[PDB]
Amino acid sequence: GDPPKRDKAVAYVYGLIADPRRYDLGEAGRYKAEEKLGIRLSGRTLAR
Amino acid sequence: DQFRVGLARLARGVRERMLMGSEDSLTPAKLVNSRPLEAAIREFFSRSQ
Amino acid sequence: QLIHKDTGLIKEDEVFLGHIPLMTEDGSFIINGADRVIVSQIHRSPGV
Amino acid sequence: DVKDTSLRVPPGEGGIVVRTVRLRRGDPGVELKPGVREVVRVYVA
Amino acid sequence: SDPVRQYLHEIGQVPLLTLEEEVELARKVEEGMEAIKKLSEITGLDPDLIREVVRAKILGSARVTLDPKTVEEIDQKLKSLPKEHKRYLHIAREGEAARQHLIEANLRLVVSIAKKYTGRGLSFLDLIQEGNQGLIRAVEKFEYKRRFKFSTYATWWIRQAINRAIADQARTIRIPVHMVETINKLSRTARQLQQELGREPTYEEIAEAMGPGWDAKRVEETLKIAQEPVSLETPIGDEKDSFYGDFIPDEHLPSPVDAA
DNA sequence: ATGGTTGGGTATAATGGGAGTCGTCTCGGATGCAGG
DNA sequence: CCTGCATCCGAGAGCTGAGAACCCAACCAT
């Protein structure tokens, strides 16, 4: 229903999984993800 | 965590006040309304289970 | 500090943000004259 | 034109009065509720 | 569900306006207003009555104090105008349509203004409706000759209506508007005094900063009158089994001991 | 005759919101979908 | 067209004790 504006969609998706002010895996969450997945995370969010 | 929530309210109010008023008369002290911060801390320390 | 993006006019100020309750030497708080304890919370850790 | 609204010992209670505290409006650091002139506390052991 | 999204969808279903379309609509409503006053002076009837009947006809029978026979008979009575007078009727009808269209197009300005008044005792939709009332008032009193944009004059009316609604409906115990603004000014002065002093001000400081005619007893009385009541259903204790009213005795009905 | 209370007005321009909630389990009825 | 079969929603889940604009002018009440 919401109009599919490019910037509005960008802001919504950025806030959902990519905004450090909204999405936050803790330091413990970062450590758990790194040890389970065997990767190195740049930050505490799902995407950059 | 409660402090962070209060700071989020403070920042939201600060942005609201920034998008208003003569930009020449705007000072750091004038933009910040601290009341939600006390609201959050006091609610945590008086009402949290 | 209040900073203009182009002008560079710097306005520095110390702001009173309020009061933070202080933990006593034994580890408790005095809220409205009553002794209180904050109980630690166990929950599921963030991660994958 | 006045009536008794005094504080009395509830049934099954009592003891020895060991402390009394009086707080009035205006004493430094006192923050009373609006309308309340003074508060009296009695500690009984 | 989610009525805010439904209202936003309905409000977005109406397209915006440009400057030319806006000035056209305002000119048409202005000429319609001039037409209804001209007609009222010609026939000698109350302008409000003829405006209401004309708008009732423009809406239709869907909009049911005036019996249908009455408004229909007046409509036929206005069909007795030879010429250069039915033009007044047509201009008035087009002006009413212009009024409707302009209000529908600019309801979004009401939404934009009201979205920054949330969290003050009134829900968002109530704020939107009061802003809509203010927008209708502004459309009524807008003069397009000044070449000013519609929003410039509409914003003041919308904000006035919203502020009046906050002052008049936010509290279960009604407090008059002057006392409401006095309380807000007291709170603002108190917070500035707290910022400057680094602690909660005493009543003396607030009274001093208020100005002449303000002393500690007056600020104490104002603060006592500004308290809002609490709910009888406030949960007491951790478990969900005790309410506040469980601790309130009745002092009106006589006790069995008193009755004897 | 006084305060307390109420109605009206402000003119550059402004035009679709925001918190939230994710660890119960079953059971019974109403219901839409799949097959024949 | 009938039927069965997942799917969704709603309604339950022991007792007692206690715990955030401002201003200006007209107008009824007492």
Curated annotation (Swiss-Prot), chain A:
Positions of transmembrane segments: none
Domain of life the protein comes from: Bacteria
Family: Belongs to the RNA polymerase beta chain family.
Subunit (UniProt): The RNAP catalytic core consists of 2 alpha, 1 beta, 1 beta' and 1 omega subunit. When a sigma factor is associated with the core the holoenzyme is formed, which can initiate transcription.
Function description: DNA-dependent RNA polymerase catalyzes the transcription of DNA into RNA using the four ribonucleoside triphosphates as substrates.
Name this polypeptide is given: DNA-directed RNA polymerase subunit beta
Organism placement in taxonomy: Bacteria, Thermotogati, Deinococcota, Deinococci, Thermales
Gene designation: rpoB
Residues of the full protein shown: 245 to 292 of 1119
Curated annotation (Swiss-Prot), chain E:
Region (Sigma-70 factor domain-2): 102-172
Keywords: Cytoplasm, DNA-binding, Sigma factor, Transcription, Transcription regulation
Gene Ontology terms describing biological process: DNA-templated transcription initiation
Disulfide-bond pairs as recorded: none
Superkingdom of source: Bacteria
Interaction with polymerase core subunit RpoC (motif): residue ranges: 126-129
Function: Sigma factors are initiation factors that promote the attachment of RNA polymerase to specific initiation sites and are then released. This sigma factor is the primary sigma factor during exponential growth.
Record text about domains: Contains 4 domains, connected by flexible linkers. In the active conformation, the domains are in an extended conformation, each making extensive interactions with the RNA polymerase catalytic core. In the autoinhibited state, sigma-70 factor domain-1 packs closely together with sigma-70 factor domains-2 and -4, contrary to the extended conformation that is seen when the protein is part of the RNA polymerase holoenzyme.
Name of the molecule in the record: RNA polymerase sigma factor SigA
Organism: Thermus thermophilus (strain ATCC BAA-163 / DSM 7039 / HB27)
Gene, per the UniProt record: sigA
Residues of the full protein shown: 78 to 345 of 423
